[PDB]
Design an enzyme around this catalytic site. Structure first.
Site, PDB file in Angstrom:
ATOM      1  N   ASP A 179      -0.113  -3.828   0.462  1.00 48.67           N
ATOM      2  CA  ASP A 179      -1.360  -3.330  -0.093  1.00 48.67           C
ATOM      3  C   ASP A 179      -1.220  -2.481  -1.338  1.00 48.67           C
ATOM      4  O   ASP A 179      -2.222  -1.947  -1.796  1.00 48.67           O
ATOM      5  CB  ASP A 179      -2.098  -2.556   1.011  1.00 48.67           C
ATOM      6  CG  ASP A 179      -1.355  -1.376   1.609  1.00 48.67           C
ATOM      7  OD1 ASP A 179      -0.414  -0.867   0.999  1.00 48.67           O
ATOM      8  OD2 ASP A 179      -1.714  -0.967   2.707  1.00 48.67           O
ATOM      9  N   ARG A 200      -3.767   0.487  -5.149  1.00 48.41           N
ATOM     10  CA  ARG A 200      -3.811   0.392  -3.714  1.00 48.41           C
ATOM     11  C   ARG A 200      -5.109  -0.388  -3.442  1.00 48.41           C
ATOM     12  O   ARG A 200      -6.186  -0.134  -4.000  1.00 48.41           O
ATOM     13  CB  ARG A 200      -3.833   1.796  -3.180  1.00 48.41           C
ATOM     14  CG  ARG A 200      -4.111   1.922  -1.695  1.00 48.41           C
ATOM     15  CD  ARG A 200      -2.996   1.305  -0.847  1.00 48.41           C
ATOM     16  NE  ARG A 200      -3.130   1.667   0.559  1.00 48.41           N
ATOM     17  CZ  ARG A 200      -3.970   1.040   1.387  1.00 48.41           C
ATOM     18  NH1 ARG A 200      -4.753   0.030   0.999  1.00 48.41           N
ATOM     19  NH2 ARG A 200      -4.018   1.433   2.656  1.00 48.41           N
ATOM     20  N   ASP A 214      -5.649  -2.114   5.125  1.00 50.51           N
ATOM     21  CA  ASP A 214      -4.370  -1.500   5.356  1.00 50.51           C
ATOM     22  C   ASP A 214      -3.386  -2.536   5.844  1.00 50.51           C
ATOM     23  O   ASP A 214      -3.611  -3.153   6.886  1.00 50.51           O
ATOM     24  CB  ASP A 214      -4.495  -0.392   6.383  1.00 50.51           C
ATOM     25  CG  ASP A 214      -3.223   0.401   6.539  1.00 50.51           C
ATOM     26  OD1 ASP A 214      -2.468   0.528   5.578  1.00 50.51           O
ATOM     27  OD2 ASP A 214      -2.989   0.912   7.628  1.00 50.51           O
ATOM     28  N   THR A 215      -2.335  -2.815   5.084  1.00 48.42           N
ATOM     29  CA  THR A 215      -1.298  -3.695   5.585  1.00 48.42           C
ATOM     30  C   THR A 215      -0.319  -2.794   6.331  1.00 48.42           C
ATOM     31  O   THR A 215      -0.257  -1.594   6.013  1.00 48.42           O
ATOM     32  CB  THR A 215      -0.537  -4.444   4.452  1.00 48.42           C
ATOM     33  OG1 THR A 215      -0.150  -3.527   3.431  1.00 48.42           O
ATOM     34  CG2 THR A 215      -1.423  -5.523   3.873  1.00 48.42           C
ATOM     35  N   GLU A 220       3.029  -0.787   7.487  1.00 48.59           N
ATOM     36  CA  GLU A 220       3.946   0.052   6.762  1.00 48.59           C
ATOM     37  C   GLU A 220       5.316  -0.560   6.735  1.00 48.59           C
ATOM     38  O   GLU A 220       5.730  -1.166   7.728  1.00 48.59           O
ATOM     39  CB  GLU A 220       4.001   1.401   7.439  1.00 48.59           C
ATOM     40  CG  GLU A 220       4.798   2.435   6.672  1.00 48.59           C
ATOM     41  CD  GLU A 220       4.268   2.662   5.259  1.00 48.59           C
ATOM     42  OE1 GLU A 220       3.104   3.018   5.124  1.00 48.59           O
ATOM     43  OE2 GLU A 220       5.015   2.485   4.297  1.00 48.59           O
ATOM     44  N   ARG A 240      -3.271   6.578  -7.300  1.00 52.68           N
ATOM     45  CA  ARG A 240      -3.288   5.111  -7.254  1.00 52.68           C
ATOM     46  C   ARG A 240      -4.686   4.592  -7.543  1.00 52.68           C
ATOM     47  O   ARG A 240      -5.663   5.087  -6.980  1.00 52.68           O
ATOM     48  CB  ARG A 240      -2.871   4.591  -5.882  1.00 52.68           C
ATOM     49  CG  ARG A 240      -1.467   5.030  -5.514  1.00 52.68           C
ATOM     50  CD  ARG A 240      -1.023   4.539  -4.139  1.00 52.68           C
ATOM     51  NE  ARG A 240      -1.881   5.081  -3.113  1.00 52.68           N
ATOM     52  CZ  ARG A 240      -1.660   4.845  -1.820  1.00 52.68           C
ATOM     53  NH1 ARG A 240      -0.623   4.105  -1.404  1.00 52.68           N
ATOM     54  NH2 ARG A 240      -2.543   5.301  -0.934  1.00 52.68           N
TER      55      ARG A 240
END
Ligand SMILES: Cc1cn([C@H]2C[C@H](OP(=O)(O)O)[C@@H](COP(=O)(O)O)O2)c(=O)[nH]c1=O
Ligand SMILES: [Ca+2]
EC number: 3.1.31.1
Length: 137
Positions: free
Chosen positions: A16, A30, A35-36, A38, A82
């Site tokens: 992401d 971002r 949310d991909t 971690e 970001r």
């Protein structure tokens, strides 16, 4: 009133977060509303489907002819500096593609930056859920 603007890929970091040249300036972007998993932060570790999401985003932006960013209606950067945007790889939104593949969850919905929230939740994530894809397996 949202509009797509050109940008050039510098490098994909994970599922992401991608670095792009935007108006002559190198910036980290971002992806809005997703949310991909971690792959970098110690408290979290490599979450399941994190490597797969990173590979997916990298393939998508690296093989694109044209990268476009579309800012939403509110803040254009987050607290880490970001850029917050919807990113398009040959007109296909990477944010949506990840959610449709079950490689990202709709997350961090902060109004007014929620223009594509209903489509990402009701269509793309709902469909990935129904098919039990990847994070949803
Ligand atoms: C997507 C997004 C993330 N963020 C912040 C929330 C999270 O802060 P914290 O670091 O304080 O938890 C973090 C999640 O991004 P990552 O998924 O890149 O870690 O980025 C925003 O502020 N706005 C956004 O629109
Ligand atoms: Ca993430």
């Amino acid at each position: 009133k949202l509009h797509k603007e050109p940008a050039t890929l510098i490098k994909a970091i994970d599922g992401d977060t991608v670095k792009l040249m935007y108006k002559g300036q190198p910036m980290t972007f971002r992806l809005l509303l997703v949310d991909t998993p971690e792959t970098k932060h110690p408290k979290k570790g490599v979450e399941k489907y994190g490597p797969e999401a990173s590979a997916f985003t990298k393939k998508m932006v690296e093989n694109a002819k044209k990268i476009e960013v579309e800012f939403d209606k509110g803040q254009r950067t987050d607290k880490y500096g970001r850029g917050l945007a919807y990113i398009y790889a040959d007109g296909k939104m990477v944010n949506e593609a990840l959610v449709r593949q079950g490689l990202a969850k709709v997350a961090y919905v902060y109004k007014p930056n929620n223009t594509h929230e209903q489509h990402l939740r009701g269509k793309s994530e709902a469909q990935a859920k129904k098919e039990k894809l990847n994070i949803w397996s």
